[PDB]
Design a protein around this ligand. Structure first.
Ligand SMILES: *[C@@H]1O[C@H](CO[C@@H]2O[C@@H](C)[C@@H](O)[C@@H](O)[C@@H]2O)[C@@H](O[C@@H]2O[C@H](CO)[C@@H](O[C@@H]3O[C@H](CO[C@H]4O[C@H](CO)[C@@H](O)[C@H](O)[C@@H]4O)[C@@H](O)[C@H](O[C@H]4O[C@H](CO)[C@@H](O)[C@H](O)[C@@H]4O)[C@@H]3O)[C@H](O)[C@H]2NC(C)=O)[C@H](O)[C@H]1NC(C)=O
Ligand SMILES: *[C@@H]1O[C@H](CO)[C@@H](O[C@@H]2O[C@H](CO)[C@@H](O[C@@H]3O[C@H](CO[C@H]4O[C@H](CO)[C@@H](O)[C@H](O)[C@@H]4O)[C@@H](O)[C@H](O[C@H]4O[C@H](CO)[C@@H](O)[C@H](O)[C@@H]4O)[C@@H]3O)[C@H](O)[C@H]2NC(C)=O)[C@H](O)[C@H]1NC(C)=O
Ligand SMILES: CCCCCCCC(=O)N[C@@H](CO[C@H]1O[C@H](CO)[C@H](O)[C@H](O)[C@H]1O)[C@H](O)[C@H](O)CCCC(=O)NCCCCCCc1ccccc1
Ligand SMILES: CCCCCCCCCCCCCCCC(=O)O
Ligand SMILES: *[C@@H]1O[C@H](CO)[C@@H](O)[C@H](O)[C@H]1NC(C)=O
Ligand SMILES: *[C@@H]1O[C@H](CO)[C@@H](O)[C@H](O)[C@H]1NC(C)=O
Lengths: 99, 271
């Protein structure tokens, strides 16, 4: 395919343990627009993931926001996994809070 | 003081017997409309998405777009190496003193190939030569040309003035950010990357700087503006520092919503 997706993973609020929050997965700079986005908790697919409408920038590259409600804990690790025609293998980016 | 209105169309053709078209509309950084391939009608994503158009004026405009959507899908498969990606970006930039500039840009496989300029469709320099004849066919349709000229010169600026009145409180809304500090691994050996997170701010303009007292740490790297799901912005400003150098550093945030009272977070406040 034409262009490879970049992945950014960030929380809406400061990530306090036991406090409800939202985890964002912002996928940009990809073409064609056909894409599979998975948010992961401890390696397992999170079922309730809300997706923004797909859009594109002045450079014509596509972008989309995936977000899920989540309560951070000490030990649980989160990641965003993207499947796209531009890449042979799925691309996983880990939420970097205590990295 | 300069609102960009953008109608984005995304059309995918996988083969002779599979295509979908989905549309989004933006006034600045706020989505005003959605139009899925699944839906017959254009969906409002704001209470003020109709602007100052009566139902009759909107139904007329919507019908014209429903005709355009079906004609476009048929005309592309008429002319048509699959798969095929076509993008359309049409709208106007509003300037002060009741001034504006309209545009209509077309991309094929993520490359800008065609625009509507003046009174006619034209291929851009470097566009595939096989487009020239289709564009001459399309330019023979004077009705379509006259309709596009009306939409770009009249309907676009008229409609957006109505959106700017109808959506004033949303467009003028002020949301205060929350900030927090963290560290991540540095690519340099003796160092760690200090991170100042700023989330929940609107509008987009913001200033985030690492400070030692009144001295700006000018190595501060401003990250990209990332969207939150609640129509607010996220940004992180980073500074790679040697172990021990963290002591006495603060992150300072300036934003319109703070009205002069900057957010100042000191690193290791609780020690
Ligand atoms: C809508 O507005 C159009 C202009 O606005 C731009 O395009 C729109 C779609 C938006 O994107 C907007 O944001 C843009 O700003 C307007 O288009 C204009 O149409 C007129 C009439 O058709 C054109 O005039 C004719 O121009 C040619 C020469 O063109 C060349 O030179 C000029 C000047 O340097 C350049 O501007 C061009 O780019 C070209 O390089 C003349 O030869 C011609 O003269 C002949 O025709 C006239 C009129 O009948 C006779 O009186 C003469 O005697 C001649 O027989 C025209 O003067 C104009 O070029 C074109 N503008 C542009 C930028 O292309 C459109 O008409 C508006 N439509 C409606 C319905 O409001
Ligand atoms: C009035 O008119 C002005 C100019 O014509 C418009 O301002 C432009 O607005 C757009 C959209 O907000 C801006 O585009 C965005 O710029 C961000 C900042 O880019 C600079 O800084 C970052 C780091 O901070 C650098 O990485 C970058 O190279 C630039 O130097 C970017 O972060 C944005 O990119 C992100 O989002 C897009 C999605 O749109 C993704 O595709 C990207 O991958 C990335 O995640 C984005 O590019 C543009 O920079 C502005 N230009 C100027 C000159 O200000 C106003 O919008 C207009 N006013 C209204 C109300 O419409
Ligand atoms: C945003 C574009 C403007 C929308 C309004 C245009 C009027 C319109 O819908 N009119 C179609 C129907 O025309 C017929 O009815 C009209 C009344 O509504 C008039 O009476 C008109 O005279 C009459 O013929 C018309 O079929 C039009 O051609 C639809 C497509 C318009 C369009 O997208 N074209 C985009 C061109 C760029 C893509 C081509 C390049 C390309 C080609 C192949 C592969 C890749 C790229
Ligand atoms: C191209 C003219 C732009 C000015 C007219 C704006 C009128 C309001 C827009 C409503 C959304 C219509 C979506 C159409 C996108 C498409 O599928 O091509
Ligand atoms: C057309 O493309 C669709 C979407 O990828 C695919 O599922 C289908 O098998 C294709 N059909 C034909 C007839 O080629
Ligand atoms: C898109 O919409 C058209 C018209 O409603 C329909 O015929 C087509 O099958 C749709 N495509 C998909 C992939 O759902």
């Amino acid at each position: 395919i034409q262009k490879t997706p970049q992945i950014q993973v960030y929380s809406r609020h400061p990530p306090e343990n036991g406090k409800p929050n939202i985890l964002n997965c912002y996928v940009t700079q990809f073409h064609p627009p056909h894409i599979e986005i998975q948010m992961l908790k401890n390696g397992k697919k999170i079922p309730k993931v809300e997706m923004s409408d797909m859009s594109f920038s002045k450079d014509w590259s596509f972008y989309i926001l995936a977000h899920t409600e989540f309560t951070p804990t000490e030990t649980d690790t989160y990641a965003c996994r993207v499947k796209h025609a531009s890449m042979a293998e799925p691309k996983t980016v880990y939420w970097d809070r205590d990295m | 003081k300069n609102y960009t209105f953008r109608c984005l169309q995304m059309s995918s053709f996988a083969n002779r017997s599979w295509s979908r078209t989905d549309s989004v509309v933006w006034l600045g950084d706020l989505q005003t409309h959605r139009w899925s391939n699944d839906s017959a009608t254009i969906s409002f994503t704001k209470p003020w998405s109709q602007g100052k158009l009566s139902n009759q004026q909107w139904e007329k405009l919507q019908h014209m777009f429903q005709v355009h959507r079906v004609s476009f899908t048929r005309d592309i498969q008429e002319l048509v190496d699959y798969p095929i990606e076509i993008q359309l970006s049409a709208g106007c930039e509003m300037y002060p003193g009741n001034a504006s500039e309209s545009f209509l840009h077309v991309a094929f496989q993520g490359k800008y190939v065609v625009r509507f300029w003046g009174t006619s469709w034209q291929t851009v320099p470097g566009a595939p030569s096989w487009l020239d004849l289709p564009i001459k066919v399309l330019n023979a349709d004077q009705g379509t040309s006259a309709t596009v000229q009306m939409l770009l010169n009249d309907t676009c600026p008229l409609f957006v003035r109505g959106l700017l009145e109808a959506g004033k409180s949303d467009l003028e809304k002020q949301e205060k950010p929350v900030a927090w500090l963290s560290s991540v691994p540095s690519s340099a050996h003796g160092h760690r990357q200090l991170v100042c997170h700023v989330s929940g701010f609107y509008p987009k303009p913001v200033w985030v700087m690492w400070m030692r007292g009144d001295q700006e740490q000018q190595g501060t790297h401003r990250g990209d503006f990332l969207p939150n799901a609640d129509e607010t912005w996220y940004l992180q400003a980073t500074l790679d520092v040697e172990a021990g150098e963290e002591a006495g550093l603060a992150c300072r945030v300036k934003h319109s919503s703070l009205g002069g009272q900057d957010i100042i977070l000191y690193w290791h406040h609780h020690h």
